Amino acid sequence: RFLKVKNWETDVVLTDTLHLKSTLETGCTEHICMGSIMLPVRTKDQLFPLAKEFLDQYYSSIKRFGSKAHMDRLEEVNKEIESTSTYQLKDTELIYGAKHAWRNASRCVGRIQWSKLQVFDARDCTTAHGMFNYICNHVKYATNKGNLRSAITIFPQRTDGKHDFRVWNSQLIRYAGYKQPDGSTLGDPANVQFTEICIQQGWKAPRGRFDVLPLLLQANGNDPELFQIPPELVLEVPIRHPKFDWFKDLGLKWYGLPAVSNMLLEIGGLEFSACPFSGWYMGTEIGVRDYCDNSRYNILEEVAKKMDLDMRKTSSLWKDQALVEINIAVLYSFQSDKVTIVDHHSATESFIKHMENEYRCRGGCPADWVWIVPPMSGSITPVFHQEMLNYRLTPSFEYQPDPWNTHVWKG
Amino acid sequence: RFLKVKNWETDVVLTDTLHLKSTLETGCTEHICMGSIMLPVRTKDQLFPLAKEFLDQYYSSIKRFGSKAHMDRLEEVNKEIESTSTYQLKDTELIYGAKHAWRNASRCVGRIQWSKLQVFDARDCTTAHGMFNYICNHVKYATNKGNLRSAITIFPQRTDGKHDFRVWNSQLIRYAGYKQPDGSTLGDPANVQFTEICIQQGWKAPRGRFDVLPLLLQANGNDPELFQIPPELVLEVPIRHPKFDWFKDLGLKWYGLPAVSNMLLEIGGLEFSACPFSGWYMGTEIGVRDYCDNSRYNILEEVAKKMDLDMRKTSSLWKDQALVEINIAVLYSFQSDKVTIVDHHSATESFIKHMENEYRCRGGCPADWVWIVPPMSGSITPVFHQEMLNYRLTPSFEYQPDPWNTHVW
C-alpha cells in the first residue's frame, strides 16, 4: 500500500508507506470518522511480540539488525519475560523509546526537535519524596534560566497495575482555580477539581488568581503526597504589550515551562504511567487557549473594553482584534524576558519541513490535522493546506484517565 | 452503535444514532484516519434498493409509512425501473431530496437554513441555451437585489452517462486568471486553467483583475457552449474599510452570490450532474481564503505595508493583524451595500444550535470539523470545542472532477 497526501497550496504530493507499520486502532471505520473526538497488567502472551517488535526496531535503527548482540538481547528478554512476567529496558533502549514516542506523537507540532530530548532515568525511584526530588531537578534543568531545553523524567513502569507511579497533576506547573459561592471562579477554571483535591489533602491555598499548584505524587500505588515546588524554580513571565501600556495592569502572567505529566509512555509493551515531559510553548497555547477560551481565563471582553472596540455586534470582529493583540503581548513578553517561545507561524513552517523530511527518510509522518492547525489564523499557516494521515505508531504517549477516579485509597 | 459527542467548553454530551443509517465509505479505516484529505452507470439491480431506501424515508417524513400510497409508489417505481432502466421523481420527492442533500452536507456550516431552499425544477431543459436561461433566472431570484435567498436549479438526471448535463464552471460567478509573460498571475490564480479553455472556445478575455468568467454549459452530453451572464445580474461589492481610508485604493471587489455549480446531487439512486445551488457568504470565505491564501489573490503583504506594521519577523503577528482588518473590510462593505453576509461568530453559533435540534429531532448531524471550523480565530468560535461525527448519508452532494478531463470533443 502507498497512500498519497497533497498540499493544496504547493501541489507537493507525498507518498506514505510508514502507515503499514501501524498496529493499533484509530477510532475511525469505513462508515464513521472520529477525527474530532478527543478520546476516540498485560499477559506474557501479548508481551513478547511487543518486546520483539520494539527491539527489532531499535536494532535496525542502530544498524545491527540480525547481529549476535540483537539475537542475544531477544533471547535475554524472552527469558526474562517467561520467568518474571516482565522485563527491564537497557538505558539505550529507554532513551531511543522516549525519543520515538515523541517522534510518533501525531498531535505534536514541535516534532522537528524530537531527537534532542534529555532523558532522566528515574526507574530507581521508590517513594513520593524521591519523585519530588527528580521532578525539581527536571524543572530546574528544563528551565535553564529561560533557555528552555526539552526533557523527560521516567519513573518505574507498571507491574500489576496495583503499584502504579503517577503524577496527579496534569502539568507540573499550573495555577489553582477556586469556585466561588456566587458561581464565579477565581484563577484557572480548568483546575478547580484538582485544586479541591489538593485542599482536601492539606494544601493551604493562597486563594489568588495565579497560585502555582503543589505537586500530588503517587509512588508504588500508595496514596499520593503533597509537595510545593520551590518558588525560585518556577520561572514566570508578567505579560505586557509593546504598544498598549494599560496591558500590564490586567495583572496577567504565565509560567515559562510547559510540562505534561498525565500521559502514559508505552515502549516495547512496557507501560510508564509517570513520565513528565517538557519542551517550550507555542504562543497561541497561552494567548488563544489559556487566556481566551470561555472556560479558561476568558479575558477577551476586558481586553476589547480597554481597546475601545465596537462590542455591540460580533461582525465588527472585536473578539478577533483583541485576540491578536493578546497573542502579540504573550510573544513580546516571553521574548523580552529571554524565555524560549515559538510563534505559530514559525512553528508550523518548521513542522512542514519536518514532515517532508520524515516522508523522505522514514516513509511517513503521522499527524492529527485537528490538533496541528493552530487555534487562530488557521489558513494563513502552511499546515492548514497540508493533507495529513493520522495513524498510531509505537513507542507512544497515550492519555490516561485522572487518577482520582481510579485510585484505591488506602488511608 | 450509540456514539457520544461531547462539547468541551459546555460539557453538553449528545448521543448519535443517525450514523447507523449511514451508507457509503468515509475513506477512514481502523488503522488510518483520512479526515484531512480533500478527496478521500447504475444497473436495474443496484437502482431499486436505492429508490426504496429513499422512498421509505420520504413516506416516513410525511407520516404515511407503510400506507397504500407508499406501497403503490414503490410498486410504480419498481415497474418503471424494470421496464425503462430508470425512473422519474415526483415534484414533491425532488424538493424533499434536494433539501435533504443540503441537510446531509457534512461540510456545510449554514445548514440551519436547510428547509428554506427554493428548488427550480429544470428537468424539462434540453439545450445549452435553455440551461443559460434557467441559470440567469436562478441568479436573479437568489440575488434578490442583495436580500439573498437560497436556491437550487436541477437539470435532467444522468441516463446512460453519455448524455450528462454539466456546468463546466466550479461556481456560477467567478473571476478569470491569466498567466503573464512577466511570470506572475493577473486575476484569480485558481481559474487559470478554466480561463484558457474559455478563450480556447472563443471567449474574448478582457484581461483585467476581476473579469466575471462566462458560463460553459453542457447539455445532453454535447460539447459545452459559452454564454455570458448579463452584467446587470452579477451583483458585486467594492471593498472598503470603516477606519482605513486607504483600503478602497487597493481596488478590491467580490461578487455577492456564492453559487456552487460542480457538484452531483444523488437522490434515490438517480444522479443529477448539473444542480447549481447558492446561499450567501460567510465573510471568512472571501476575506481569509479568496484574498489571503498564497495561491489566491495573496494580498496580505500589500495590506500589511499600508498599515505600516513590523514585517521583519513573524512573531510581530503582522499577518494576523492584517488578516483581521481584511475581514473587517469584507463584512463592513457587504453590510453597507445591503448584501446578505454572515460573520463566522454568528454562523458557528447558529450551527451549534442546528446540531442540537438535529440531535434531538433526528438523532444526529454528520459534520466535518476540518471544514466547519472557520479558517481564522478557530477556538474563539463554539464549533472548535464541539466533537463531531462525520459520516455520509443520502440524498447527498458529491464533488465531481472537472469535465475537461472526462470530455471528448
Ligand code: HEM
Ligand atoms: C520543543 C517544544 C515543543 C513544542 C513547541 C510543542 C508543541 C506542541 C503543541 C502546541 C501541542 C498541542 C498542545 C495542546 O494543544 O494541548 C503539542 C502536543 C503534544 N506534544 Fe509537543 N511540543 C514540544 C515538545 C514536546 C515534547 C518534549 C514532547 C515529549 C517528549 C511532546 C509530546 C507531545 C504530546 C504527547 C502531545 C499531545 C498531548 C495531548 O494529547 O494532550 N512535545 N505539542
Ligand code: HEM
Ligand atoms: C445559506 C447560506 C449558506 C452558508 C452561510 C453556507 C456555508 C458554507 C460554508 C462556509 C462552506 C464551506 C465553503 C468552503 O470553504 O468552500 C459550505 C460548504 C458546503 N455547503 Fe453550504 N452554506 C450555505 C448554503 C448552502 C446551500 C443552499 C447548499 C445546497 C443546497 C449548501 C451545501 C453545501 C455543500 C454541499 C458544501 C461542501 C462544498 C464543497 O465540498 O466544496 N450550502 N457551506
Ligand SMILES: Cc1cc(N)nc(C[C@@H]2CNC[C@@H]2OCCNCCc2cccc(F)c2)c1
Ligand atoms: C481530554 C484530553 C485528551 C488529551 N489527549 N489531552 C488533553 C490535554 C488538553 C489538550 N489541550 C489542552 C490540554 O492540554 C494542555 C497542556 N498541553 C501542552 C502540550 C505541550 C506543549 C508544549 C510542550 C510540551 F511538552 C507539551 C485532554
Ligand SMILES: Cc1cc(N)nc(C[C@@H]2CNC[C@@H]2OCCNCCc2cccc(F)c2)c1
Ligand atoms: C478539491 C475540492 C473538493 C471539494 N469538495 N470542493 C472544492 C472547492 C473548494 C473548497 N473550498 C474552496 C473551494 O470552494 C469554494 C466554493 N465554496 C462555497 C461553498 C458555499 C458557501 C456558501 C453558500 C453556498 F451555496 C456554497 C475543491
Ligand SMILES: C[C@H](O)[C@H](O)[C@H]1CNc2nc(N)[nH]c(=O)c2N1
Ligand atoms: C472537539 C475537538 O476535537 C477539540 O476541541 C480539539 C480541537 N483541536 C485541538 N488542538 C489542540 N492543539 N489542542 C486541543 O485541545 C484541541 N482541542
Ligand SMILES: C[C@H](O)[C@H](O)[C@H]1CNc2nc(N)[nH]c(=O)c2N1
Ligand atoms: C488539507 C485540508 O483538508 C484542506 O486545506 C481544507 C481544510 N479545511 C477547509 N475548510 C473549508 N471550509 N474549506 C476548505 O477548502 C478547507 N480546506
Ligand SMILES: [Zn+2]
Ligand atoms: Zn477518520
